[PDB]
Design a protein around this ligand. Structure first.
Ligand SMILES: O=C1NC(=O)[C@@]2(N1)O[C@H](CO)[C@@H](O)[C@H](O)[C@H]2O
Ligand SMILES: O=C1NC(=O)[C@@]2(N1)O[C@H](CO)[C@@H](O)[C@H](O)[C@H]2O
Lengths: 813, 813
């Protein structure tokens, strides 16, 4: 209670507030939960607290939304098929300044608030970085006072819960709604219809989309609180409902209700299932009906010319790209605008954000599927394509191959629509998510488009919210910073640059170190308690946590780990800096190599963790079920952050920024936002290694030959021979033959090309770690220059450079 | 507001209570609903009222349940696959004495409480009489202070909503949960597992049921308030949940969740679907786990001998009959009791109520299905059968045909288990639901069983609650009665016999008549408003409302209606008492003849209602979507109650009692509880006609020949010739050929045999109706002798004669 008390960033425990909070906790326990103190469990107490905390959002939510309707500012509609929100109780209390008051109120009731917070399920409606970016963006938009609306789908099952059984991943449905969600509000009264299939009738009123099947879209609205500004915006997620022999017809309502059943668990990989396309159109269609209704009730041919002055649609990836043709369908077929005026409006309303580089991560839907499911949309896409290729032909006359490359329609045995090209043609702005990625979009990936319309192309380096990713998850660090520079940095993170004044301050050096040690102790206690794994608290915590994907190269980290193990065995008496290497992350079901990688991590640990010569000098653990609530516990405890993707493959990364803000040093390639992070802190304060993008390209030009590296590096050959001969799988000697085959003959990500410099860089890490004072001084140089990586900076640049609206920190009454 | 005010039976509007109710309405509107007075609709105001009213049930619910756990009285478990509860807001306010206070509170807020009550959806978890009996029984059990628990299944879809399209029934899913159910409380924490399929392993610990598939049973608990006694019991309904490639496995969770999806819409007809058997075992299995847990936490080999002293299981029909073998399975396989002691306990715990006569309404499950789905239960049933047939053989030595007739196992191409015989063997009491039906169970249907164990056989004449079926639905009548004899009759209905003192009281005669006229005006306004049908308010309202079934003979009512029409056309100048004949009721989907009957009613109206000679002297309407909330509006408005089943087919009826309590006179056969109703009022005050059961049997003995009636009755022949030649279906002349064929050659219910006496009796009705004073005096003789038909009388006799517990009207603090 004592540290919680002491933490001034957690606010005040005013005596009347504490009294009111207690009263309301007991009121909810009785009237809402219908429980009594003799039978109540810790889960019942968590719900009573959550309902109490929620009541504090209500007046601000109704007043904020009423303010927008009165004032009529331009509205921002952020459309996304993922929102990885995490848990909400602590975030709500931080943003409303209720944390110490609730801590005191619950303490007076005989309860431990932190134990109650652990009952909450993450809302895990996203796969990883992109879903988590959308959640940091809704927080930043509310903190910056924008009239912003996140729109998505309410999946009944989010990303699966990962169990590890016999060292392998197993997927279990994440039934996050089992005990209810006290944060959302069902809005059945605002249910709207969404159409599928059918056919187009061309008459004298234009086209008519008829004979469709209807699925209803019921919205659930969740409040999104800004940081101490009394703004509460809304996330509206749509849930699928069947329209309004006999038994079997009732049971068959499940087919339409299956649209919102489960998140597709792919990360940087397009799976073209019809059910996903349905999910996409379902979000787009219901969402554009709200946009159009709100526009018509706003101010006021008069109306649609001003539509782009009052609406921005922000497409998160191409997942909601059908908003481009759906808006044209509504404006032309239903509102009766002429095509040209409708297209003018559509392009000024929409903007697209791209988050990938790999060709197989782009959405390319078969024309036959679009024809069957959304026949009027395919007509509209072909017309969009003919007018855009007419502009290409007039700008670059006679360049026939440019027409083929830029077309929305891709040739082949199955013709497809390239949804990225559709977004570029229909948006006034296109952006990537880190300077290197935005630049490669202009130079290579979409170079023809950039040449046609260079003003469309922008950069918006990603960021993370310093509320969840510093005040909530690492209050100790938040408090020692506040002790020196006040609290303003929480909503103005560039003020962390003031911490460079303390690089030679003995107390500050002391306290940064003390906070990291406390977080390592809290993490080790969580691991012993919840998963019964024991880790050495006096070891360097070396952490690689992110989805499992060949491009992120968890395998390169495996090679390093086995190198440390083999070096210890060769020279057992030689001192080495003790390490706890932790790797965690989910594999898409169906991505075989990623599943084998998880099994290799566990298998390495099975040998390494039981070798008496190694003892506690080296431990390798796989962290099960990596997810936002676990990132909040392990990132603050980390010493080394592994950001080792092959140069050119991580479009930005965001876990890299989380670690930098939480006092870890980074070992990484010049990839994604790592380049900007190293620029901000100074490259001498980062452990950059390996090929740069120019090097990777040179290797591709002459041909990547993994055998050359195997032949020239004895230590590498040793590990490959261990893997192949069954040293890490004695009961099934050929278990890892597929990983070896890939590494030796088909590695698109050049794991062996960075092995030598990776292992050398790791040694430099270890050498600095032996000097605690200078390790900590380099940490202070990182925390103090992490300010650019606030999502408030990123959202302020979307507002000013894309949406045309000015962000504000002015408090609402 | 004025009559509402004046109605003293509606309680007091205390000034502080009105103030508190208003405060709490606004609090719920803001914090619970997240609405504000500018956007709030009548639906939002209904929910704010419902949440306010619900808060008044909470303390009594927690205190009542705590009282049982402390005091440890014998607990009554009433198991039923149907609970036709209807709407709850008004019932809750009546039982808690909040009706005038809420009426005043809402009136001060500018709202009309009666309009808000109309927003509520009936909870229509039952088909008709049997489901509605279970709901009147839960009310009576709470009013009599019993520690009773109703246990059922929470169907997502209850009985379908009936639309009439082109004069035919159409079924629509009744999505009663769309806007939520504010009355229930989800209890996910108390979810339990239910097993299916698998196989039995016989070991040295006895049998072991292994390799099963699990479906979870999540309970939802709904409060059940007694009448002004502060008792609030619980209805617990179980909801199916799946246990704890990849996408398809998540979607396939729907298969297990389909167990609680929809009510089978059959009335007096067994459909042997596997999914229904699953529904049955799901209720039984989860329910017996609660019973056993509660017993073990109660008092205290010691334990199970006292099990029948602390538990009663009441089986509503054979639908939960699997409780007999499930209890033996739990006691023998899991608790390790020996078979004999377990059977002793099981028979003293269980009791069965039978509600049907027709052979096809009895449950007979294929042994192959039971073998596949519930292999240990089939083993147990065969053992139960062998020991029971050993008792039969020792009691009646050498009677081999008795063994075949009484066996639980029925022979044939498909062998089946007769669930009624299983209940009789495993229960200490068996009862029918009206004296004539209980007697036929002993004399014919289960005569061998009665001869073996005569002490098991009982009678429990059905009843209805006078709360919903008099105070709620007909406050005007409730008030004129209270004016004379106080309010005690509401929970002691035999006090209505005091009203026989007023058969010659001019004011009372005047006011009974005035109340009926007001109800007819309210009903006619509802019909004009909601369905846009116009009825003549100065006509005799002749009402037949009940499920559509050949045995209930809506067709006999059709023949009468056409007879009136044909008699008018023959002698147009002759005065006749104007009538509005209304028939309503649902047909099971799939029951062809019942669907054709609905179409014949509409078709008759299509001719009759547009004939200028008839004008407003005769109108015939089909009332769409007959359901508990509609019965509460039309029964109080009725003048004549049609209860015309063939003698011997309606086991009791309950709509007959509703009409008697609400001031209608009855035209009926000596069938079911009609016989007891006529006994109570005096046969001179009832319009009894037709064959008695002895007559029906004599006709069966010589052979029913419908042609004889056609040949001897000119007026009947005329109608049959109209039907056959297309007079009621000119565009499709042969439309009713199937109804004619059945009537003429395959009528199991002898419609033509009662035609002549039915039409004569109807004329006697009409003659009395021409003398308003003497019609009303005969109504007073009916209302005043309706007291035996209170469900409190019926439940007091179950408590004393079957459950061994004493009912009480003592108030809880
Ligand atoms: O498909 C993707 N999943 C991601 O996490 C991703 N693209 O988007 C993120 C948010 O822009 C990026 O930071 C990450 O580099 C990229 O892989
Ligand atoms: O299967 C049935 N449905 C009914 O309504 C029924 N049996 O049960 C009721 C309740 O006991 C009876 O009143 C009714 O006569 C009988 O048909």
């Amino acid at each position: 209670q004592e540290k919680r008390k002491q933490i001034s960033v957690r606010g005040l425990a005013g005596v009347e507030n504490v009294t009111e909070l207690k009263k309301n906790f007991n009121r909810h326990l009785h009237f809402t939960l219908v429980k009594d103190r003799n039978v109540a469990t810790p889960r019942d107490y968590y719900f009573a607290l959550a309902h109490t905390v929620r009541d504090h959002l209500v007046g601000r939510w109704i007043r904020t939304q009423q303010h927008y309707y009165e004032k009529d500012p331009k509205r921002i509609y952020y459309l996304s098929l993922e929102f990885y929100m995490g848990r909400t109780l602590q975030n709500t209390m931080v943003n409303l300044a209720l944390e110490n008051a609730c801590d005191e109120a619950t303490y007076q009731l005989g309860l431990d608030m932190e134990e109650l917070e652990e009952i909450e399920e993450d809302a895990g409606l996203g796969n990883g970085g992109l879903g988590r970016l959308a959640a940091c963006f809704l927080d930043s938009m509310a903190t910056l006072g924008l009239a912003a609306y996140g729109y998505g789908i309410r999946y009944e099952f989010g990303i699966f819960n990962q169990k590890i059984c016999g060292g392998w991943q197993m997927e279990e449905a994440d039934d996050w709604l089992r005990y209810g969600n006290p944060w959302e509000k069902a809005r059945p009264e605002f249910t709207l219809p969404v159409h599928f299939y059918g056919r187009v009738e061309h008459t004298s009123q234009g086209a008519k989309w008829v004979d469709t099947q209807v699925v209803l879209a019921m919205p659930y609205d969740t409040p999104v609180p800004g940081y101490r500004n009394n703004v509460v915006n809304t996330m509206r997620l749509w849930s699928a409902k069947a329209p309004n022999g006999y038994i079997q017809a009732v049971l068959d309502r499940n087919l339409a209700e299956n649209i919102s059943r489960v998140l597709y668990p792919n990360d940087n990989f397009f799976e073209g299932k019809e059910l996903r396309l349905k999910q996409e159109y379902f979000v787009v269609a219901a969402t554009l009906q709200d946009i159009i209704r709100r526009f018509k009730s706003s101010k006021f041919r008069t109306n649609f010319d001003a539509f782009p002055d009052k609406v921005a649609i922000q497409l998160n990836d191409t997942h909601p790209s059908l908003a481009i043709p759906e808006l044209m369908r509504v404006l032309v077929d239903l509102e009766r605008l002429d095509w040209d005026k409708a297209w003018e409006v559509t392009v000024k309303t929409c903007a697209y954000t791209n988050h990938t580089v790999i060709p197989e991560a782009l959405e390319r839907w078969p024309v036959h599927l679009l024809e069957t499911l959304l026949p009027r949309h395919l007509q509209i896409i072909y017309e969009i394509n003919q007018r855009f290729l007419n502009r290409v032909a007039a700008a670059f006359p006679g360049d026939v191959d440019r027409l083929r490359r830029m077309s929305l329609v891709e040739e082949g045995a199955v013709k497809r629509i390239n949804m990225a090209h559709l977004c570029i043609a229909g948006s006034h702005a296109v952006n990537g998510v880190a300077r290197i990625h935005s630049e490669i979009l202009k130079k290579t990936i979409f170079k023809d488009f950039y040449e046609l319309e260079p003003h469309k192309f922008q950069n918006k380096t990603n960021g993370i919210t310093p509320r969840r990713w510093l005040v909530l998850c690492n209050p100790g660090l938040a408090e020692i910073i506040a002790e020196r520079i006040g609290e303003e940095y929480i909503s103005d993170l560039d003020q962390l640059r003031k911490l460079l004044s303390y690089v030679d301050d003995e107390a500050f050096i002391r306290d940064v170190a003390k906070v990291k040690q406390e977080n390592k102790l809290k993490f080790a206690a969580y691991l012993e308690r919840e998963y019964k794994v024991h880790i050495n608290p006096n070891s360097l915590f070396d952490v690689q946590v992110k989805r499992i994907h060949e491009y992120k190269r968890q395998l390169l980290n495996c090679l390093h780990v086995i190198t440390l193990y083999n070096r210890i065995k060769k020279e057992p008496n030689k001192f080495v800096v003790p390490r706890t290497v932790m790797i965690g992350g989910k594999a898409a079901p169906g991505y075989h190599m990623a599943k084998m990688i998880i099994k290799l991590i566990t298998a390495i640990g099975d040998v390494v963790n039981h070798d008496p010569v190694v003892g506690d000098r080296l431990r390798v653990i796989f962290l099960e079920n990596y997810r936002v609530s676990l990132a909040e516990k392990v990132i603050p405890a980390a010493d080394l952050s592994e950001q080792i993707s092959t140069a050119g493959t991580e479009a930005s990364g965001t876990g890299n920024m989380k670690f930098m803000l939480n006092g870890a040093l980074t070992i990484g390639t010049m990839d994604g936002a790592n380049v900007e992070m190293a620029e901000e802190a100074g490259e001498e304060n980062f452990f950059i290694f390996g090929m740069r993008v120019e090097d990777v390209d040179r290797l591709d030009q002459r041909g990547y030959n993994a055998q050359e590296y195997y032949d020239r590096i004895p230590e590498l050959r040793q590990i490959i021979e261990q893997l192949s001969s069954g040293f890490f799988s004695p009961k099934q000697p050929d278990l890892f033959k597929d990983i070896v085959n890939m590494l030796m003959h088909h590695d698109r990500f050049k794991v062996f090309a960075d092995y030598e410099e990776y292992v050398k860089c790791q040694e430099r890490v270890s050498a600095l770690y032996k000097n605690p004072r200078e390790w900590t001084r380099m940490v202070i140089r990182n925390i103090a220059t992490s300010g650019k990586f606030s999502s408030d900076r990123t959202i302020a640049q979307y507002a000013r450079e894309i949406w045309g609206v000015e962000p504000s920190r002015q408090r609402l009454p």
